[PDB]
Design a binder for this molecule. Structure first.
Ligand SMILES: Nc1ncnc2c1ncn2[C@@H]1O[C@H](COP(=O)(O)OP(=O)(O)OP(=O)(O)O)[C@@H](O)[C@H]1O
Ligand SMILES: [Mg+2]
Lengths: 997, 309
DNA sequence: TGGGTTTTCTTTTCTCTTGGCGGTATGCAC
RNA sequence: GAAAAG
DNA sequence: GTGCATACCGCCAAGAGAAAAGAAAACCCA
């Protein structure tokens, strides 16, 4: 592959084209060309960048020189070089003889002019000026007409993308003009790139000390602003002078943004530093990402694509508007592409070392540039300028990491000032408008900010390569499901927010999930003070997390907002805003409801009652009629919880999910007291959850008859749970061991419940060790208050031994399929290639697990950073991690496929569908329709030979190259050794009441 | 596991642990008596010997010899590195608290200025020598575990590779690091014997094991240096030795808001003073001169949040 | 064949070891 | 050092 | 033509910070 210095120089040239510093890039070109030993690094793209730049300027004088440099270097001109030549001849309006001669040279060169136009990435302005250049030579040249957009014709996605049948597509309850206004609001919010929200803490009394603290912080911030401006100017002059003496600098990378914007960004990251401090590499990553995002937004602002996206979005909103009717109903992506689609300039991100040195330089600039007086606590004494941030080495085992900890007087001034505002990025806030439809892995969730289709912890990763080398119609289902999940309009439950604010502003209630303030922390004998500081710091961390969450919830109290959605590498869907979403804690799910409601209908109140009994955590093993009768028995408690949440009998606090139970009690209380229960418009999301859903999929692929009955794939009157069966086996083993007088059984007694055994039984069907189950049950025993805490370790070992003894001779097909997946992953990862597979909806999935962690040490003023070069510099795959990842990753990919099929086929029936993982939420009116569609999509997904098609795909891709056959023949034995299905008529899943419940 | 099983100079080590003849019969907490020959040689001296053992597989020999010596050998099953175990509730018979030891033996706590009440002999682990040095150093600076009961001398075998790593001074720039300064301020190492690998028959590239006789020093704790703020001093040492080529100014600009030039002017060391050329006593008095500064309030930036991030 | 190392998978809040010396290749002064 | 979701 | 200065890279180190209280099993390394 390309060298690191080659990548850095190419990024330098490309940034010069963006910053209009074409004279500077030509200077490095002639410096690196006039001398020999570094000229072996220059490639064709490096010359074509400056070629295209001089083309946009219409300068023949330098372009002929660069062409002479290309000819002298010994490398042949490519398509983009002649495209740049045609561009520069077309821009200058010069006569037809030269364009005729050069296009004759193009024809003599033999490469197609249509290949210059098509399948090679150019801007539309470049295409237009090449068209203007060619129209003087050949006025009879015409580009091929635009083909109609292709339609995905896969069997799972053939009911969708079908012109026949009646479709009742959902429409938002907002009109067209209000949606356009919210688009304007979100466009302004993303242009500003930051959001300021009011804190939910009670405001401090504005005394003299508070105002003097605020004035001191203000004058320090002004001094830091001026100092950072001076430091940034000195750095840019040093980089410009360092460039002039022939070295690759970062100079165009710091002129991408304005000086004020960079200084303000550094001040913002300085403001949001925790008192403990952050890693230097973390600050480098975050600073580089913020700079890249602001570069993208600024480039789209200057280039004029904001107005194009605006004019296209006002036309696109007519499909989803209540009062606007399209001539033919279709999906949001299909309507986005049916109109004139604006061109999305694919902006290549910076290389990982370039990002690292940019963030490292900006972090070092923040550390050196900011000065403070001697101590902010009592600053009246004579002051030496000490740094605001300190670079302290923090030590964990042999490892030594650099941490930028703020000075404690700066910290003390920060909590003494009591700043009433909090600042978020525009990416970290829920969108105010419907998101852009997912039309490509590039054009995605947000209006202007770049957003990945697949979340990746690593910087440069091969996921987008599979997302772009796929067939164009392969990703249509996943992108449409992402658009559908992002199109759900959310609304904050104000009453639950009022009660959580009541508990948060006062002394918190940790029983209900509201963090207590650290000022109420409790205060041999010498160890107790350190223990109290540890407890106070834990409550400091959790309350700060809640401070972000409830502030962002208060910011969205009276506005309809949207949660844009992404995937991971194996397909599971997450909302992009991290703080306030529906995948969070019980409080966060309680605050959220649907912004559009449905009338309950003849059997909608029953679903609300069943959902409430499910949220109580009681009557879990009981049938639906028993849950409904139980809800009728506790009706007075339901009304007392709804009417008097904190001043009543407090029935809702005893529920397993208390705040969700309280919100559902309020919904049932308003529904029953209505005059017509069927006519009550309900906005509460009712949840249907899978019972052992990984085991449900294992029994679906295995076609077993015993495990499928255990995980409710066979119809039954009562629900079936394997967790309670294992719990009963462990409890009778505990009774036998307590009979013998063993101490651990006497300590445990009745403490073995479903919850302590649930995650381990859930996990044993993946490649878990006994150490993982040990920690799994040790955490569950540690969170129990009534358990004696000196017995946690030995009871954990005993309980793990009885749990793994209990699962013997159980789930035979599941263990067979998991062993086959683990064996196949081990034989793939023993070779060089990592494990790849294609989902039944067509999504390619690869695992980013590689052994080599390159040091990639970068010298600098403060220290040398250590980052793993993730852009395939790591080569050897991590065999153990591939083995331990593949059996869960496949099952979760099939989870994603089932979820996307259910969403896409509930969209055609007019159902609002959102999904936590194996938890499908819809309106209480249409729970039965969602259940029926979920069962049919489960049948259609699992009527496909997923194991057999996986085996044929794996043999076709990873077992067909000749040079590996002698080593892969055993793998050819493994891949074609899938277990037999057996006898289980899977159509009975359509009659299973307790499939999802 | 390394075990002493040779009669060579066993009487010589016995005369080493005799000390002054006028002393009373002095308790010897021998650690891991595997073969029991060294315990027999120690019992030939006539003083009381208490065996602390991790090898319960061959347990009856020690107590069987103990009843023959009329109860002088009070054998109690315990491993020395495992006293006061780490976040553990249920006390197993291998690992037990020091209060259990000292309540069984009747011997009690004394003030730090008092005389030595007790002697320990035993092994370091074959590989975990550095970690066990850190356990004993943490128990010595924070006067807990054994060292709560007094100024407990402990005499054991040390590896050759880590010996001069503990005896290093200003000089030997390759091997001079934190544990040297941490121990040598309160340790009093004197090498008693220099035996090679041949006599040490491990029970089932020569390594020469030296007897280092750790004694806590009386003048360890001051007004500034306390058993509370010893982690701050430990962090000073490891931060200063993180960059060995750097100077004291470079590390103390990151360690304290105090001007390091003024602190070095007070201590008497120049501004060009490098970390590897500074005395172990100078580290302690550097900590004491930073600690006694009364004009400022925030004197250090170390806090337990620096354990992670 | 005996011993070091990690231990089911993501996502997020609060989120990667650094340094120093020697070994080798290459350009420059004489 | 902790917490939350599947 | 020969020797010296400079840049880049592999490696193994310790404050491998303790916790070596504690379980033991497979995968990889010497
Ligand atoms: N800790 C985990 N590790 C791996 N996969 C998990 C984990 N928690 C959940 N999952 C995945 O999520 C699904 C299980 O989610 P869920 O919490 O509903 O559990 P469950 O086994 O269905 O139990 P329940 O019936 O109590 O809801 C499966 O697809 C499983 O693979
Ligand atoms: Mg479930």
């Amino acid at each position: 592959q390309l060298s690191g210095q080659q990548q850095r120089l190419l990024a330098f040239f490309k940034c010069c084209l963006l910053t209009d510093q074409l004279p500077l890039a030509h200077h490095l070109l002639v410096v690196h060309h006039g001398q020999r030993q570094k000229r072996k690094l220059l490639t064709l793209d490096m010359y074509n960048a400056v070629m295209l730049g001089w083309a946009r300027q219409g300068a023949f004088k330098e372009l002929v020189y660069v062409l002479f440099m290309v000819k002298d270097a010994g490398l042949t001109p490519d398509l983009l070089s002649y495209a740049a030549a045609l561009q520069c001849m077309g821009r200058q309006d010069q006569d037809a003889g030269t364009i005729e001669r050069c296009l004759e040279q193009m024809s003599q060169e033999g490469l197609k002019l249509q290949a210059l136009f098509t399948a090679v990435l150019l801007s539309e302005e470049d295409r237009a000026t090449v068209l203007k250049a060619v129209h003087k030579v050949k006025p009879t040249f015409s580009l091929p007409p635009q083909l109609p957009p292709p339609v995905n014709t896969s069997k799972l996605l053939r009911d969708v993308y079908a012109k026949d049948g009646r479709v009742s597509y959902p429409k938002l309850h907002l009109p067209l003009k209000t949606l356009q206004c919210l688009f304007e609001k979100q466009l302004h919010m993303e242009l500003a790139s930051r959001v300021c929200v009011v804190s939910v803490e009670k405001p401090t009394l504005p005394s003299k000390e508070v105002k003097h603290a605020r004035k001191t912080l203000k004058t320090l911030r002004d001094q830091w602003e001026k100092a950072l401006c001076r430091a940034l100017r000195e750095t840019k002059n040093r980089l410009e002078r360092e460039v002039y003496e022939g070295r690759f600098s970062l100079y165009p990378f710091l002129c991408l943004l304005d000086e004020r914007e960079v200084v303000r960004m550094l001040l913002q990251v300085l403001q949001a530093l925790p008192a403990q401090g952050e890693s230097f590499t973390t600050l480098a990553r975050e600073l580089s990402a913020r700079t890249f995002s602001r570069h993208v937004v600024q480039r789209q602002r200057v280039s004029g694509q904001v107005q194009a996206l605006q004019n296209h979005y006002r036309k696109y909103l007519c499909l989803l508007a209540s009062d606007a009717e399209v001539p033919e109903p279709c999906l949001p992506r299909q309507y986005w592409e049916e109109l004139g689609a604006p061109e999305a300039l694919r902006e290549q991100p910076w290389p990982l070392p370039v990002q690292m040195e940019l963030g490292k330089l900006l972090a070092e600039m923040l550390v050196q540039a900011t000065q403070m007086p001697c101590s902010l606590d009592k600053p009246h004494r004579s002051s030496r300028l000490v740094p605001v941030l300190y670079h302290v080495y923090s030590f964990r085992n042999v490892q030594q990491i650099g941490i930028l900890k703020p000075h404690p007087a700066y910290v003390q001034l920060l909590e003494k000032a009591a700043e009433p505002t909090l600042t978020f990025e525009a990416v970290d806030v829920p969108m105010l408008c419907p998101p852009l439809p997912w039309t490509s892995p590039h054009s995605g969730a947000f209006l202007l900010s770049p957003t990945k289709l697949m979340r990746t912890v690593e910087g440069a990763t091969q996921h987008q390569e599979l997302l772009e080398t796929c067939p164009p119609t392969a990703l249509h289902g996943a992108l449409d499901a992402l658009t559908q999940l992002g199109n759900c309009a959310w609304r904050v439950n104000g009453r639950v927010l009022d009660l959580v604010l009541q508990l948060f502003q006062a002394k918190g209630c940790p029983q209900l999930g509201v963090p207590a303030p650290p000022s109420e922390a409790p205060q041999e004998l010498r160890r107790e003070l350190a223990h109290c500081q540890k407890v106070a710091r834990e409550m400091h961390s959790l309350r700060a997390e809640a401070l972000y969450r409830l502030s962002l919830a208060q910011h969205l109290r009276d506005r309809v907002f949207w949660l844009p959605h992404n995937m991971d590498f194996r397909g599971r869907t997450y909302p992009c805003p991290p703080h306030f979403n529906h995948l969070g804690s019980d409080v966060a799910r309680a605050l959220l409801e649907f912004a559009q409601g449905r009338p309950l209908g003849p059997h909608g109140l029953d679903w609300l009652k069943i959902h409430l009994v499910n949220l109580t955590g009681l009557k879990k093993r009981e049938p639906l009629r028993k849950r409904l009768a139980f809800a009728e028995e506790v009706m007075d408690d339901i009304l007392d919880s709804a009417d008097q949440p904190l001043t009543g009998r407090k029935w809702w606090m005893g529920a397993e999910e208390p705040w969700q139970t309280l919100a559902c009690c309020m919904e049932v209380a308003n529904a029953v007291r209505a005059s017509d229960p069927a006519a009550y418009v309900s906005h509460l999301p009712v949840h249907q959850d899978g019972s052992c859903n990984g085991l449900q999929h294992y029994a679906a692929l295995g076609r077993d008859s015993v495990g499928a009955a255990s995980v409710n794939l066979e119809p039954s009157d009562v629900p079936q749970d394997v967790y309670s069966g294992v719990a009963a086996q462990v409890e009778v083993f505990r009774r036998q061991d307590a009979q013998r007088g063993m101490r651990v059984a006497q300590v445990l007694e009745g403490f073995i419940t479903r919850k302590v055994v649930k995650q381990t039984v859930m996990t044993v069907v993946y490649g878990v060790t006994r150490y993982g189950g040990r920690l799994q049950i040790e955490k569950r025993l540690r969170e129990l208050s009534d358990f004696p805490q000196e017995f946690v370790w030995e009871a954990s070992h005993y309980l793990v031994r009885q749990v793994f003894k209990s699962l013997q001779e159980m789930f035979s097909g599941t263990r067979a399929i998991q062993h086959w997946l683990t064996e196949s992953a081990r034989l793939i990862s023993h070779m060089g290639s990592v494990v790849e597979w294609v989902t039944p909806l067509g999504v390619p999935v690869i695992q980013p697990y590689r052994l080599d962690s390159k040091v990639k040490q970068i010298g600098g003023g403060i220290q040398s950073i250590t980052y793993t070069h993730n852009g395939d510099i790591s080569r050897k795959p991590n065999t153990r991690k591939q083995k331990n990842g593949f059996p869960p990753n496949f099952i979760h990919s099939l989870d994603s496929s089932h979820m996307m099929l259910t969403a896409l086929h509930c969209y055609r029936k007019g159902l609002t569908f959102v999904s936590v993982h194996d938890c499908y939420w819809t309106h209480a009116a249409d729970v039965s329709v969602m259940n029926q569609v979920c069962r049919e999509q489960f049948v259609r997904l699992h009527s496909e030979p997923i194991l057999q098609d996986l085996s044929r795909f794996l043999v076709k891709r990873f077992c067909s190259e000749p040079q590996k056959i002698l080593e892969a023949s055993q793998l050819k034995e493994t891949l074609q050794a899938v277990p037999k299905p057996g006898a289980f008529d899977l159509e009975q899943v359509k009659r299973s009441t307790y499939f999802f419940s | 596991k390394r075990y002493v099983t040779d009669r060579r100079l066993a009487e010589t080590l016995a005369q080493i642990y005799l000390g002054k003849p006028s002393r009373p019969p002095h308790l010897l907490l021998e650690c891991n008596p595997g073969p029991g020959i060294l315990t027999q040689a120690l019992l030939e001296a006539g003083a009381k010997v208490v065996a602390l053992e991790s090898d319960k597989t061959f347990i009856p020999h020690l107590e069987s010899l103990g009843k023959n010596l009329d109860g002088k050998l009070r054998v109690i099953h315990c491993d020395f590195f495992k006293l006061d175990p780490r976040s553990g509730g249920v006390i197993k018979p291998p690992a037990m608290s020091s209060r259990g030891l000292f309540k069984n033996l009747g011997i009690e706590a004394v003030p730090w200025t008092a005389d030595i009440p007790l002697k320990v002999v035993g092994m370091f682990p074959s590989r975990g020598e550095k970690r066990a040095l850190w356990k004993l150093a943490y128990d010595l600076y924070s006067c807990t575990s054994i060292y709560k009961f007094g100024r407990i001398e402990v005499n054991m075998f040390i590896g050759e590779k880590e010996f001069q790593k503990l005896m290093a001074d200003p000089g030997n720039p390759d091997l001079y690091h934190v544990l040297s300064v941490i121990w040598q301020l309160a340790c009093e190492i004197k090498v008693l014997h220099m035996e090679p690998w041949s006599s040490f028959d491990i029970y089932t590239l020569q390594q020469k094991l030296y007897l280092i006789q750790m004694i806590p020093r009386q003048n360890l704790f001051t007004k500034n240096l306390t058993p509370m703020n010893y982690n701050i001093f430990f962090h000073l040492l490891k931060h200063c030795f993180g960059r060995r080529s750097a100077t004291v100014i470079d590390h103390l600009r990151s360690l304290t808001p105090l001007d390091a030039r003024d602190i070095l002017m007070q201590i008497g060391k120049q501004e060009d003073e490098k970390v590897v050329n500074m005395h172990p006593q100078d580290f302690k008095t550097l900590f004491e001169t930073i600690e006694r500064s009364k004009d400022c309030a925030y004197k250090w930036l170390y806090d337990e949040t620096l354990e992670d991030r």
